[PDB]
C-alpha cells in the first residue's frame, strides 16, 4: 500500500503518497519541511488504510538532532490518536557517526523480522549524508565517501523490498526524488525531479 502524507495535493503528486518497497528522498534546506514531513509520516503509517496508513510501526534514525517526540504527541492528539500509543510504536536511534548508521540497519532489520500485532512499515533516515559529508573531507576521500554511501543505500533498498517497508530519507544540495522549498509564511512547495503546495500545521502536513 501507500502511506498518506496528510496533504491531498502532495499525495496527488506522489501518486497516492509515499510507497513501500521504494526509497523516497526529500531535498531542501532548514525549514523546507523535511523533518516536519518525516514526523507526520511516522504518525500516518500507524493509521488504518481508510485514514491513509498501513497499521504499522515506524523507525527513525536521527543524525542531525532533529527528533522531537513532543511534536509526535502534538500531531497524534490533533489527528485523533492516543499519543502514548503512537510514541510506543516509533523506534528511535541517534546515529553518532557513519559506522553507527550502517550498524543501526542490522538492528532495524532484526527488529523488523521480529515485528512481522503492529509490524514496522516505515524507516526514516534524517539526515542521510550528514555524517558521510562531515567525516570524509576532500577529493582524496571522495572515493571512500561515495562507496560507503552507496553501500548504505543498497542496504536501505534491501530492507524496503525484504520487509515491504517504505524508506523515507532526507538530504541537502535509484530513489524517488522530491525537492521542498518555503513559500507564503508557513506554506511549502514540493517539486518532482508538476508542483504541489502543502502547509505545516498542528496536525502535521496538509494543504
Amino acid at each position: 500500500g501507500r502511506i498518506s502524507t496528510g496533504s491531498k495535493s502532495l499525495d496527488k503528486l506522489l501518486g497516492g503518497g509515499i510507497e513501500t518497497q521504494a526509497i523516497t528522498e526529500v531535498f531542501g534546506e532548514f525549514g523546507s519541511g523535511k523533518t516536519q514531513l518525516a514526523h507526520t509520516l511516522a504518525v500516518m503509517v500507524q493509521l488504518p488504510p481508510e485514514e491513509g496508513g498501513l497499521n504499522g510501526s515506524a523507525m527513525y534514525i536521527d543524525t542531525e538532532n532533529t527528533f522531537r517526540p513532543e511534536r509526535l504527541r502534538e500531531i497524534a492528539q490533533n489527528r485523533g490518536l492516543d499519543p502514548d500509543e503512537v510514541l510506543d510504536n516509533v523506534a528511535y536511534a541517534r546515529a553518532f557517526n557513519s559506522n553507527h548508521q550502517m550498524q543501526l540497519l542490522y538492528q532495524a532489520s532484526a527488529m523488523m523480522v521480529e515485528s512481522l500485532d503492529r509490524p514496522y512499515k516505515l524507516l526514516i533516515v534524517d539526515s542521510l549524508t550528514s555524517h558521510f559529508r562531515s567525516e570524509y573531507i576532500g577529493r582524496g576521500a571522495l572515493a571512500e565517501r561515495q562507496q560507503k554511501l552507496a553501500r548504505f543505500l543498497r542496504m536501505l533498498h534491501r530492507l524496503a523490498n525484504e520487509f515491504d517497508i517504505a524508506v523515507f530519507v532526507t538530504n541537502q544540495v535509484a530513489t524517488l526524488r522530491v525537492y521542498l522549498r518555503k513559500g507564503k509564511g508557513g506554506k511549502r512547495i514540493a517539486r518532482l525531479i508538476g508542483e504541489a503546495v502543502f502547509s505545516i500545521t498542528e496536525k502535521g502536513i496538509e494543504d
Binding site: 503512537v86 523506534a91 553507527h100 538492528q107 532484526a110 527488529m111
Partner: peptide, 30 residues
Amino acid sequence: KLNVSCEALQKACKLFSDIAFSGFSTASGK
C-alpha cells in the same frame, strides 16, 4: 529500550552478507 534476540540478529547478518553500539528505544524511552 528495544532489544532483539540473537536468533533474529544472526538472520539479519545473512541478509546483508554480500555487503557494541547503541540500539533503538521507543519515543517514550523504553
